[PDB]
């Protein structure tokens, strides 16, 4: 690995600089290097890792959707034949996206998840595993599509089970997991009723626990609760 010669602390420092510079590819590479040092990550370091890859893959997904839409329109009736280029370039972006997903899943499997014993760390990594299988599912069309979908579901479900046992209903990690698993149900699993039920129940159980929180914790939890409400509004 090209980051093998750099100090762990320097990689983390540079990840923070890259974030400030909106250099998310660099940020991700620095954080990959840091993970590969083999030590567990702190809370802050998990945030940096997840922010970096979310931004990289987010850009790739947005691009893939633009290209997929153009490709779909090219395959309608009355559309002029423009040759293989749109498919080829969509495939190029797709392959790059799959590569990033495989990289993140690789870090989780080797060996972040197996060393994560605290609820916060284990739920966070399992949520990430669900997310990156979900992104693979978004672009999947082959023999393995059902297995990819099931891999996302399984990771999210394990995270949910731990979160419900070990974390309060307002915990931002528990909330963010539920938000994303709800989207999985709606967009990937063709289960809009499950998506809506999950978002509603999550929101309501969080609402009832807000009274226990400080002002700062209240702000953190309510931000994510608003996202749940936003999705419910979109879906109902």
């Amino acid at each position: 690995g090209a980051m093998g010669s750099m100090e762990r602390a320097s990689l983390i420092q540079k990840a923070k600089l890259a974030e400030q510079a909106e250099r998310y590819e660099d940020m991700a590479a620095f954080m990959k290097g840091a993970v590969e040092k083999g030590e567990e990550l702190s809370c802050e370091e998990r945030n940096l890792l997840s922010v970096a890859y979310k931004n990289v893959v987010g850009g790739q997904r947005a691009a893939w959707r633009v290209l997929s839409s153009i490709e779909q329109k090219s395959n309608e009736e009355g559309s002029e034949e423009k040759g293989p280029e749109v498919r080829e370039y969509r495939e190029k972006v797709e392959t790059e996206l799959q590569g990033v997903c495989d990289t993140v899943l690789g870090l989780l499997d080797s060996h972040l998840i197996k060393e994560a014993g605290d609820a916060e760390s284990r739920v966070f990594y399992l949520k990430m595993k669900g997310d990156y299988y979900r992104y693979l599912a978004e672009v999947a069309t082959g023999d393995d599509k059902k297995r990819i979908i099931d891999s996302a579901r399984s990771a999210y479900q394990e995270a949910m089970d731990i979160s419900k046992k070990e974390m309060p209903p307002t915990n931002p990690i528990r909330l963010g997991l539920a938000l994303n698993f709800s989207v999985f149900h709606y967009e990937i699993a063709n289960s809009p009723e499950e998506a809506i039920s999950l978002a509603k129940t999550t929101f309501d159980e969080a609402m009832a626990d807000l009274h226990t929180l400080s002002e700062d914790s209240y702000k953190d939890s309510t931000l994510i609760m608003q996202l749940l409400r936003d999705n419910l509004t979109l879906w109902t």
């Binding site: 997310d131 963010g176 938000l179 994303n180 989207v183 994510i224 996202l227 936003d230 999705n231």
Partner: peptide, 5 residues
């Protein structure tokens, strides 16, 4: 697209 974090 729906919100995710």
């Amino acid at each position: 697209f729906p919100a995710t974090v």
